[PDB]
Amino acid sequence: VVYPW
Amino acid sequence: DTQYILPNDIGVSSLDCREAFRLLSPTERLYAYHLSRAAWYGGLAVLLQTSPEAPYIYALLSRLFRAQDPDQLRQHALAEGLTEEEYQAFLVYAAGVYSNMGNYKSFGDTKFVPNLPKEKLERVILGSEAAQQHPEEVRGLWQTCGELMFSLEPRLRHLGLGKEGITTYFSGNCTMEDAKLAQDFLDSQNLSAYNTRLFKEVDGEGKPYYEVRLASVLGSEPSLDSEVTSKLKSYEFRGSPFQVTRGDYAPILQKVVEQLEKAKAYAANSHQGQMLAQYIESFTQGSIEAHKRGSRFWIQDKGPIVESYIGFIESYRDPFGSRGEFEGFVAVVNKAMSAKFERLVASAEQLLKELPWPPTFEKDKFLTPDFTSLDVLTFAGSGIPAGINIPNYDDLRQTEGFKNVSLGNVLAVAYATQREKLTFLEEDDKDLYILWKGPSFDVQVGLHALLGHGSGKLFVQDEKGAFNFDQETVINPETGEQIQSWYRSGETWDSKFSTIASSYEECRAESVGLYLCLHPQVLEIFGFEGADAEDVIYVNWLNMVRAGLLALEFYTPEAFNWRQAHMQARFVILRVLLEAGEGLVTITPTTGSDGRPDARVRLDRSKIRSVGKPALERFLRRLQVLKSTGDVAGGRALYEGYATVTDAPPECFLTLRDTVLLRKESRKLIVQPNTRLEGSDVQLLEYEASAAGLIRSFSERFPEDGPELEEILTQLATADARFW
Numbered sequence: 001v002v003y004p005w
Numbered sequence: 006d007t008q009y010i011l012p013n014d015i016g017v018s019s020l021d022c023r024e025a026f027r028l029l030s031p032t033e034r035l036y037a038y039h040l041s042r043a044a045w046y047g048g049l050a051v052l053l054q055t056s057p058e059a060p061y062i063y064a065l066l067s068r069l070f071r072a073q074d075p076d077q078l079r080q081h082a083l084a085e086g087l088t089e090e091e092y093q094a095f096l097v098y099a100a101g102v103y104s105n106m107g108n109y110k111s112f113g114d115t116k117f118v119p120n121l122p123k124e125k126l127e128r129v130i131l132g133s134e135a136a137q138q139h140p141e142e143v144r145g146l147w148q149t150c151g152e153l154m155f156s157l158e159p160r161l162r163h164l165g166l167g168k169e170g171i172t173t174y175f176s177g178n179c180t181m182e183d184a185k186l187a188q189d190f191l192d193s194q195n196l197s198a199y200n201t202r203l204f205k206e207v208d209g210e211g212k213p214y215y216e217v218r219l220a221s222v223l224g225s226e227p228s229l230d231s232e233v234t235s236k237l238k239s240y241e242f243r244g245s246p247f248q249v250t251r252g253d254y255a256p257i258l259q260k261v262v263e264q265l266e267k268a269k270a271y272a273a274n275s276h277q278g279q280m281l282a283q284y285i286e287s288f289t290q291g292s293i294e295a296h297k298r299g300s301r302f303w304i305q306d307k308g309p310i311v312e313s314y315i316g317f318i319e320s321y322r323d324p325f326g327s328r329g330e331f332e333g334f335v336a337v338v339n340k341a342m343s344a345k346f347e348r349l350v351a352s353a354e355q356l357l358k359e360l361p362w363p364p365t366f367e368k369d370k371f372l373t374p375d376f377t378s379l380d381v382l383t384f385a386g387s388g389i390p391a392g393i394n395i396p397n398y399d400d401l402r403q404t405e406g407f408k409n410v411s412l413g414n415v416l417a418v419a420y421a422t423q424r425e426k427l428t429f430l431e432e433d434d435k436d437l438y439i440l441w442k443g444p445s446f447d448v449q450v451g452l453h454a455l456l457g458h459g460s461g462k463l464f465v466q467d468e469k470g471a472f473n474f475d476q477e478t479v480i481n482p483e484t485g486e487q488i489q490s491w492y493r494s495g496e497t498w499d500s501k502f503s504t505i506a507s508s509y510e511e512c513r514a515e516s517v518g519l520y521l522c523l524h525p526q527v528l529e530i531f532g533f534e535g536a537d538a539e540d541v542i543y544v545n546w547l548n549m550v551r552a553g554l555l556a557l558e559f560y561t562p563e564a565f566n567w568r569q570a571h572m573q574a575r576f577v578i579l580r581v582l583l584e585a586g587e588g589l590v591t592i593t594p595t596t597g598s599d600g601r602p603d604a605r606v607r608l609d610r611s612k613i614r615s616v617g618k619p620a621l622e623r624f625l626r627r628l629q630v631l632k633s634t635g636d637v638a639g640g641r642a643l644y645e646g647y648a649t650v651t652d653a654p655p656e657c658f659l660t661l662r663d664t665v666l667l668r669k670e671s672r673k674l675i676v677q678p679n680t681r682l683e684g685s686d687v688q689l690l691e692y693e694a695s696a697a698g699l700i701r702s703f704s705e706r707f708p709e710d711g712p713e714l715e716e717i718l719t720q721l722a723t724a725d726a727r728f729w
Contacts, residue, residue: 001397001507002389002571003393003449003450004571005389005391005415005418005419
């Protein structure tokens, strides 16, 4: 799972 | 109109790795070098995973820039009658396609086309130096793609199932029902969908026949042996003929495993080599279990100097939500910046007890996740994230562990967005936003990954009636009764919640982020206190409410469809805060100093703790409960309630959307370096931050096999061409 900028 | 092109002036930044490279021992460098190569190779698969024409476009472009660089090709283009500005649009498109590994945007899942006339571009192409050395292939590529390169027909405008949109995870004739029937087949067979695709063929009667194809080097041919091999055969499921096969991306995965095995030689320990071993098995046999096994070792390997990962990981871009997009990355740990994050892990066990659910809904163990700050050498795929929580297999997550990464050089790359580019904020918020945004970012990233994704337990039942919780004595705080819902064997977070799964989970994670940033220990660990901490808290919230308005550009009203999962989540959190009322947040439409429609978001800081906190706590509780018990009817009703975009007052979100669209700003493109072997010594190559430099960075990406890779993508593409 990702946290985008 | 501006939605379907990239503007000539679009930002470009260069990721900075030099000092992180300098830290590496001669061996670590060769390990990283062979790992980057594997990553970059597999990254090309993302193309077949984007659009039907994407492979062709990449081959067309790479052939152009092999023969002529952007400055040499310019000379030709301008002799052909293009204006410098038209040529620039071409570069930007080329850069965008390279950047996305396709012609649809990674953030927003929308098609983009060249911003210059078609007949013009054709001139730049057919008359190019590349067209002279190989007229056959160049004219054959432009014939198979260029039409689709420019086509904006409404059904081509966004990714998706059915006739609404474009997807390569499925044959063109597939719909939502097909995907659901497939999902059910894969579950009963205990087979993961991460690495598969669904192709559907129909007879003259019109009877559907399904091929579930797994990714692997080995065809369905006479294999070695495996948990996969026993599954290659025909089945019948609920009246539908099913065939399970493999060989997808075979010649690409072959290059990958070649490089992983080279990397194995330079491995720093036994955990690294054991995971690579299992990785090779996974990509060779198409075995996802072999990936899980490899991930287990990789979790065991703690505080390496060079961190990495590869595989089919994130399910974001699968319309249905179960299928992963290939990605890989290679990074250098930063010890300094990793200090804070270890303080965070030390106190995490403590902080979990602040979350609004019982210990019965929290994982039984709480192993230590090993949070670290990395400097990305290579990130291959649709795009680069800020932070990551891996792996994505939940059984491992709660029985074994997981890792958290903050990529400090991706953060550093966006401190950007100058004051005039800050939309919908009053002058005074602009000042705070500009000051505290960066620091506010480090915090949200940490809490998000560690406490957001790393919290919560799922209630499971295996082949027997055995539960991983205590059935009789566990009380659901909402129902005041026993637990009536849980996951069975074969069931996953993604299979059950499907379409909303990736976003719903992201909403939960960012909510704990907002919730726990209020705690003073969390903030002091990042080094803030007093009249600093309260400013970063504020901006974190101001940032969230603002992003929930900007989120509107990613909604498609006609289809009632969200195109980006992080943006949908942020809109939901915005709505939960609005619904709380009491003056916490207001959206006031206004007029811009430029005369056009504008708006202002206002956040009242004195009410964050008195109003906001209670609202989020209530929300979080409902989220976890429905996730743990895996209650889909409830889970969907809750989430699609808040995710509904309407014109209801005072907000009028549909109308607002138009102002958002008008004021939108296009996301910057990032350039990555190349590692070259001189022989024993390896070196790092850097590029200008512009469309041209990003093109060159790809031009020099594959010096050995570039022409072969192209033809490989080309043939992989025409083989399956009958499906779209």
